[PDB]
Write a protein that binds this ligand. Structure first.
Ligand SMILES: Nc1ncnc2c1ncn2[C@@H]1O[C@H](COP(=O)(O)OP(=O)(O)O)[C@@H](O)[C@H]1O
Ligand SMILES: Nc1ncnc2c1ncn2[C@@H]1O[C@H](COP(=O)(O)OP(=O)(O)O)[C@@H](O)[C@H]1O
Ligand SMILES: Nc1ncnc2c1ncn2[C@@H]1O[C@H](COP(=O)(O)OP(=O)(O)O)[C@@H](O)[C@H]1O
Ligand SMILES: Nc1ncnc2c1ncn2[C@@H]1O[C@H](COP(=O)(O)OP(=O)(O)O)[C@@H](O)[C@H]1O
Lengths: 219, 265, 359, 246, 380
């Protein structure tokens, strides 16, 4: 019964949705966790039901839920005040995924940059069956990503990805991209034709964002 | 005019909002002659309020910035609100009770966003005494103290802020000049009680052969309210005994029954 | 002589001015409308002299203005004259006397005077010059390519004379005086520290050049009132709000800023930094001379026994400020009024000193 | 006499306030504020003329507001408005671009061709845009002479009836009446001259652009150095402190 | 007075004059158009639930009333009427009369700048590097949009500014919105968190809603720390409301469905309390820092600041700049104006070296206890 994506916030999960969206000929159901968050004491549950019904009348359907945390968060037990909506909506949602009356007509895919705050009645195993890590990638994969974003732009013959890949220090996917991005704007400076190795090093040089210097006294 | 939507005529009365707020507060309308054991205060009060108003020319004629703010501190239930009400009553000044009720804000103030509006109404019915019962209250009076500290105009308005244990109130509310006359309430002894005792027992139908003193003697640690409870029970006791009158015995029981409660929670 | 020709010229101007078919046209303009019309609120707008309105009953009609008065005179989300037919915009309106400008807008005189604050000076010239000056004689800065002292801060113990200054200036000032307390800057409703600041600042910007004054800016931190929410992740924003409003973007204009805090150790540096608050002024606690002016000033306006010597009192307390001295002055008053005595005596001040100070 | 009069004469002629842009000064207090509102008046005689009338205003109090609105109303009820909205922006822009007419030069810079006549008018306009290398200023009184010039004043309503008469009838029977304004047309000008006084080195405080030699460009400068009679904005001739004399 | 005399009588002429033809000529701009458009119409706005086919009949919920499945105007095709479209509804007849556009509330439009803050790159001395990249995030892509295609890439679609309090970040916003051209949305996080639950989400949308219909617009967020930076979590659920608001901003700011030509400028003093989801690139790429001027910088700051006033031309701001190790460019300003007081405090036109020296020692030093530039350096 549906999956749950988690891991760094830059590895790459929204693409996976994007991937399914383009692939899964089924009626894609993308929804934000914040939206379900409403004012009128009865919008979150209603909307979920509304969304949980609309899907049940167009089988098949993959409902994507970005950041469950939006609507995903444990339920404390205080006195003085405390989130009722975000809770109930979860509850409502909970009562939808599983609970009275089952359904295998709808696929529910939720990513969260943080698989902790989520209450412990969303994971279980019935709600979302498969807990799925998105580990910040290695290098070759990095070498693999850079390439993807290096594809379009006009490069030349002198850009040892692996080097770049190696230089990369714990870079969630996008930061390669960012390097890739920056290196380009960098490369546009001297308006040179196609980028080069140096340009990328400088993307790294910046896509890192490690402040100034003056520490030129080391060694 | 209904469809013409022009004035057909002007009906009478409007109902007032400040009056409505006061009604909703319902703070006993107390006249002096009913509080024995609270003169020195009263005198002080008169000095800090009655005299200041009756003839502001007295303190103006002396060359002294008249006062605006007062403090009452002591046990809870000895007769503080009365001194604020009785004067205010005897003062013919609108006496306001601004606490923190959302009901009151919806009536008087259309929510606004602060407590400065409450002053607008007090102005309007000025001379008007502003009272306040027992952290949030402190600030509520603080803002008010600054509005009547050469910075507000008009005049003839005294916030009585009368709480307990002056050690509770903040410092900023004690900068020697800022609570004009600080008067303190004393616990109620045999006399004060005796007096208070005679005032409350006067309400009900009290038979002869009734020594009240003997009663306050048994009493030890009561206030302006406690005694009221005793009397009531005395009646309450007699009411259950199917007897209109109320001998001394009754009161002597209530003492315990109240001192039961006095010893209870 | 030409003065007469000048005067009558001024007079003839008055006549033509007062000297302001049409009656029908005016009635046409009356007839056009409806008696009676209908209030309703602005929403969107369009060059078609019509947009959608907003109503309590919430009919939202598309409607024209009856056009002599203007659409640009108004903003979206504003109550407008509507017929009862189509709710046709019949004209603009005047944002009735709100309950913000009032409270925040001290009209009557502030009392006191710049020759009532015994024992001050450099503190005085600093404030005045930085604020009162550029307001009255602002003609120098226009040549030294300087501007005015942005905001100013007053601090020190409790009774140094910070509120006097805010009171002194207002006494001989000429600009709208907005008296907003930070303590009031703390309400019991989420996202309400940023409305108050905007309304006070928005009200200040409207009334044109004015003095925004914030006494006890510290109370915005050094305090956590029960009825509140968020606890302190809310006050912070409210600070942030103040910090941003009292600061950047747009172009504040002539909103001068006066903050009255006792402890400057509990102010966010963002508020203290210059730009936001430049001149930082201290209020020392008299000594032996200032007090003399303070004592002489407070006992000089009353039947103070010419026998006693303000000195005894001055050299009395240890570090008594400009308040305590005033309390003693007043104490005698009540003493005076107590034993019924036009003029006070020694003990009267003594009892006062021991009645106020000590206690 | 312009508003008070016309205002009562119009409501009791579409070229009426066109002249008004004219004696300007008022082009800023009202012309710049109410000018556009005039222009907005649905009567094309206004929508024709105001864009023209803005010109001296535009070099005497031009604005950026309507400057964009002309773009909006370009095709609104009319393509001649567009034909103006291109041309007019050239006009007001051709001697009063950027600074006060920043929103003006932009458009025309984004005006090229949807039409060979637009292109014609744009070439006109962008010519006008860069007329005088894009730096010119229309002011009845060149520099800071402190005296009204009836020479150019005559050069204007001349241009009003010329482009106003042929405008009310057909496109343009001609196009040789373009330059009638030149009788006063001045650059963006600070004329900064020396103590002998035929062109020679001499300088001022900073402009934008530098210390201005004899007749070097800027507009409305209040500088360090002194003129001779009544130091002012604009044309100022330069003598220097005997100790520091230069 | 003679000139003044001529002044009065001249004015009196028109005054006398104006009254004349006034008598003579004694509504239609509008009273026509009013009465013209009086026989016109009103139309209650409507919110379309959706249309249906094999024919039209559009299905709709108005507002204060309810749903009516009702016909549509003849003048509007069966297409130019997509769902979720506030349309106008022949009041009585109750039939689509005309279409319209979308709501944005009166909180998103109230912050669209209208005017523009005079702050050219002349006042932005000591930042040849800061503005240099900024211009890339904001300037170049919005104006010259050729190159980035000639080579096919993408620009830092959003950019981050941080630094202690007083580096000039708000000028760069003001600087940009000045020589920019695009639509500069000034939205402060102070704006973002309000009262009732799930209310900020509407703001970001509107923001991104209004950002959208207008290609090439600068959204700027100063004090983002207010909106939401950290994602705590515990048995209190405190900074929760704001967090989502951030997630909302997060989500719509770079997560599923592109965003568009909404470039992004964030200003902080504490770039340390900020959610990785903000920071990451895509959402926040170019990361720019605003140093506390060194040597050559402050000289530009001094010269820039004092360049606009009557100062002594002998005295060299360089010396002063030297005595200013790590003071932001703001304080340096209290000096330049500070001398103003001193210079005015005597009676003088021009200030001296000491006038500045004192100011330096008067501002800097004296106002050192405060500074807060050393506590905000480590982003506390
Ligand atoms: N394996 C990958 N290959 C290419 N791009 C990736 C990969 N993983 C992540 N990304 C980048 O990350 C971005 C999406 O980030 P995402 O992980 O969806 O954020 P979040 O996880 O917070 O939703 C995309 O622009 C994509 O370029
Ligand atoms: N001195 C007094 N004499 C008689 N009754 C008193 C006295 N003080 C208090 N009371 C009784 O207390 C009641 C009001 O209590 P109050 O004093 O207002 O509460 P608090 O102790 O909080 O001020 C009155 O009904 C009154 O009967
Ligand atoms: N030297 C003084 N001269 C005049 N008034 C004084 C002096 N010292 C104290 N006061 C009076 O005492 C009050 C103290 O207020 P303020 O100086 O604002 O203290 P705080 O800042 O702690 O509130 C003022 O209202 C002022 O009238
Ligand atoms: N390098 C500089 N050049 C010009 N002005 C500066 C410079 N650094 C700081 N300033 C001035 O100091 C102020 C700092 O503003 P800003 O850094 O936006 O405040 P905050 O840190 O609260 O956002 C600006 O108003 C600006 O005029």
């Amino acid at each position: 019964k549906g999956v749950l994506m988690y891991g760094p916030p830059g590895t790459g999960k929204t693409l996976l949705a994007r991937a399914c969206a383009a692939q899964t000929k089924a009626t894609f159901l993308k929804l934000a966790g914040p939206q379900l968050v409403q004012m009128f004491i009865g919008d979150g549950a209603k909307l979920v039901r509304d969304a949980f019904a609309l899907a049940k009348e167009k089988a098949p359907s993959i409902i994507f839920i970005d950041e469950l945390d939006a609507i995903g968060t444990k339920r404390f037990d205080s006195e003085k005040a405390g989130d009722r909506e975000v809770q109930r909506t979860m509850l409502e949602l909970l009562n939808q995924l599983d609970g009275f009356q089952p359904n295998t007509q709808v696929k529910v895919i939720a990513a969260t940059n943080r698989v902790d705050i989520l209450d412990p009645a969303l994971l279980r195993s019935g709600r979302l069956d498969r807990k799925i890590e998105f580990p910040m990638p290695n290098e070759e994969a990095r070498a693999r990503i850079m390439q993807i974003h290096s594809r379009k732009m006009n490069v030349s013959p002198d850009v040892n990805y692996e080097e770049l890949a190696r230089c990369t220090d714990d870079f969630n996917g996008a930061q390669c991209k960012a390097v890739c991005v920056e290196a380009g704007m960098i490369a546009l400076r001297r308006g040179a034709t196609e980028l080069t190795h140096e340009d990328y090093m400088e993307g790294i040089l910046e896509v890192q964002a490690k402040k100034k210097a003056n520490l030129q006294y080391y060694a | 005019r209904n469809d013409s939507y022009t004035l057909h005529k002007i009906l009478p009365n409007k109902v007032d909002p400040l009056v409505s707020l006061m009604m909703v507060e319902k703070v006993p309308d107390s006249t002096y002659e009913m509080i024995g054991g609270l003169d020195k205060q009263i005198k002080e009060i008169k000095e800090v309020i009655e005299l200041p108003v009756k003839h502001p020319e007295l303190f103006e004629a002396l060359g002294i910035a008249q006062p605006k703010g007062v403090l009452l501190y002591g046990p809870p239930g000895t007769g503080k609100t009365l001194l604020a009400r009785a004067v205010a009553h005897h003062t013919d000044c609108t006496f306001i009770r601004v606490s923190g009720s959302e009901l009151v804000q919806k009536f008087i103030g259309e929510g606004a966003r602060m407590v400065r509006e409450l002053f607008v109404m007090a102005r309007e019915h000025a001379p008007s005494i502003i009272f306040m019962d027992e952290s949030e209250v402190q600030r509520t009076m603080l803002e008010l103290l600054n509005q009547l500290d050469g910075f507000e105009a008009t005049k003839n308005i005294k916030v009585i802020m009368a709480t307990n244990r002056i050690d509770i109130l903040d410092s900023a509310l004690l900068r020697p000049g800022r609570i004009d006359r600080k008067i303190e309430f004393p616990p109620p002894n045999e006399e004060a009680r005796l007096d208070i005792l005679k005032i409350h027992s006067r309400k009900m139908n009290l038979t002869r052969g009734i020594n009240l003193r003997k009663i306050a003697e048994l009493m030890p640690g009561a206030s302006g309210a406690e005694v009221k409870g005793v009397c009531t029970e005395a009646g309450m006791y007699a009411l259950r005994e199917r007897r209109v009158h109320v001998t001394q015995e009754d009161f002597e029981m209530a003492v315990a029954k109240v001192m039961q409660k006095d010893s209870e929670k | 002589l030409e003065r007469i020709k000048d005067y009558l010229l001024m007079e003839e101007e008055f006549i033509r001015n007062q000297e302001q078919k049409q009656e029908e046209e005016r009635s046409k303009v009356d007839d056009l409308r409806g008696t009676p019309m209908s209030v309703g609120t602005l929403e969107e707008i369009i060059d078609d002299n019509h947009a959608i309105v907003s109503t309590s009953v919430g009919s939202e009609h598309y409607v024209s203005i009856l056009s002599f008065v203007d659409k640009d005179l108004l903003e979206p989300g504003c109550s407008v004259l509507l017929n009862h037919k189509v709710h046709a915009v019949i004209g603009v309106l005047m944002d009735d006397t709100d309950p913000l400008v009032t409270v925040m807008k001290v009209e009557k005189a502030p009392q006191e005077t710049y020759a009532d604050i015994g024992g001050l000076d450099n503190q005085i010239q600093e404030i005045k010059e930085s604020v009162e000056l550029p307001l009255t004689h602002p003609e120098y800065y226009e040549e030294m390519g300087i501007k005015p002292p942005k905001g100013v801060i007053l601090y020190g113990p409790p009774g140094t004379g910070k509120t006097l200054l805010a009171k002194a200036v207002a006494n001989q000032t000429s600009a709208t005086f907005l008296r907003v307390v930070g303590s009031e800057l703390i309400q019991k409703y989420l996202g309400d520290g940023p409305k108050l600041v905007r309304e006070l600042f928005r009200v200040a910007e409207e009334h044109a050049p004015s003095i925004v004054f914030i006494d006890e800016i510290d109370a915005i931190g050094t305090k956590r009132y029960d009825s509140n929410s968020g606890g302190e992740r809310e006050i912070q924003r409210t600070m942030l709000e103040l910090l941003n409003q009292l600061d950047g973007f747009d172009s504040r204009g002539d909103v001068k800023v006066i903050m009255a805090t006792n402890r400057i150790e509990t102010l966010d540096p963002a508020l203290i930094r210059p730009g936001r608050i430049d001149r930082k002024i201290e209020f020392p606690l008299p000594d032996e001379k200032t007090k003399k002016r303070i004592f002489q000033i407070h006992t000089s306006r009353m039947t103070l026994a010419d026998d006693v010597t303000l000195d005894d009192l001055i050299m009395a307390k240890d570090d008594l400020s400009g308040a305590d001295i005033k309390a003693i002055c007043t104490e005698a008053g009540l003493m005076a009024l107590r034993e019924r005595r036009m003029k006070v005596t020694n003990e009267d001040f003594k009892k006062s000193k021991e009645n106020v100070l000590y206690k | 006499l312009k508003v008070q009069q016309l205002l009562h004469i119009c409501s009791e002629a579409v070229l009426g306030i066109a002249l008004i842009a004219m004696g300007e000064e008022i082009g800023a207090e009202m012309a710049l504020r109410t000018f556009g509102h005039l222009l907005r008046y649905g009567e094309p005689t206004l929508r024709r003329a105001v864009p023209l009338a803005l010109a001296l205003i535009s070099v005497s109090n031009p604005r950026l507001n309507i400057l964009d609105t002309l773009s909006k109303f370009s095709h609104d009820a009319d393509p001649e408005v567009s034909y103006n909205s291109i041309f007019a922006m050239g006009m007001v822009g051709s001697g009063t671009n950027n600074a006060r007419l920043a929103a003006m030069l932009r458009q025309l810079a984004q005006y090229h061709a949807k039409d060979p006549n637009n292109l014609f008018m744009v070439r006109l306009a962008q010519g006008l845009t860069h007329l005088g290398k894009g730096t010119l200023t229309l002011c009845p009184y060149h520099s800071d002479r402190q005296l009204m010039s009836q020479v150019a004043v005559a050069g204007l309503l001349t241009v009003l009836v010329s482009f106003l008469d042929v405008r009310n009838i057909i496109l343009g029977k001609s196009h040789y009446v373009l330059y009638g304004l030149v009788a006063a047309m001045q650059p963006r000008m600070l004329v900064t001259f020396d103590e002998e006084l035929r062109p020679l080195p001499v300088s001022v405080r900073v402009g934008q652009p530098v210390l201005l030699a004899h007749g070097e460009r800027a507009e409305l400068a209040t500088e360090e150095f002194l003129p001779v009679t009544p130091i002012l904005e604009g044309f100022v001739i330069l003598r220097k402190n005997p100790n520091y004399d230069l | 007075q003679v000139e003044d005399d001529i002044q009065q009588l001249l004015k009196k002429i028109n005054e006398l004059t104006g009254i004349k033809e006034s008598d003579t000529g004694l509504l239609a701009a509008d009273k026509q158009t009013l009465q013209s458009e009086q026989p016109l119409q009103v139309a209650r706005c409507t919110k379309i639930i959706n249309a249906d086919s094999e024919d039209p009949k559009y299905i709709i919920n108005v507002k204060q009333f309810a749903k009516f499945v009702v016909d549509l105007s003849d003048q509007v095709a069966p297409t130019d009427i997509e769902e979720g479209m506030r349309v106008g509804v022949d009041r009585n007849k109750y039939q689509i009369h005309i279409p319209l556009p979308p709501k944005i509330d009166p909180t998103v439009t109230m912050m669209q700048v209208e005017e523009k803050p005079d702050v050219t790159y002349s006042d932005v001395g000591g930042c040849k590097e800061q503005i240099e990249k900024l211009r890339e995030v904001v300037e170049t892509p919005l104006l010259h949009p050729e190159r980035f295609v000639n080579l096919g890439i993408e620009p830092p679609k959003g950019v981050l500014l941080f630094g202690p309090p007083g580096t000039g970040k708000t000028l760069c916003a003001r600087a940009v919105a000045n020589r920019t051209d695009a639509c500069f949305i000034r939205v402060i996080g102070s704006e973002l968190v309000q009262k009732y639950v799930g209310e900020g989400a509407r703001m970001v949308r509107e923001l991104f809603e209004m950002a959208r219909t207008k290609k090439a617009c600068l959204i700027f967020f100063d004090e983002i720390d207010a909106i939401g930076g950290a994602r705590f979590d515990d048995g209190a659920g405190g900074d929760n409301e704001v967090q989502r608001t951030m997630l909302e901003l997060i989500n719509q700011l770079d997560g599923f469905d592109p965003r568009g030509n909404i470039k992004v400028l964030m200003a902080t003093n504490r770039p340390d309390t900020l959610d990785p989801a903000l920071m990451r690139p895509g959402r926040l790429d170019r990361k720019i820092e605003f140093s506390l001027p060194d040597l050559e910088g402050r000289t530009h700051i001094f010269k820039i600041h004092a360049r606009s006033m009557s100062v002594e031309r002998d005295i060299r701001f360089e010396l002063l700049a030297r005595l200013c190790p790590n003071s932001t460019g703001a304080e340096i300003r209290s000096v330049c104006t500070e001398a103003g007081m001193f210079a005015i405090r005597a009676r003088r036109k021009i200030a001296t070296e000491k006038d500045f020296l004192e100011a330096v020692n008067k501002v800097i030093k004296s106002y050192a206890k405060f500074s807060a530039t050393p506590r905000y350096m480590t982003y506390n």
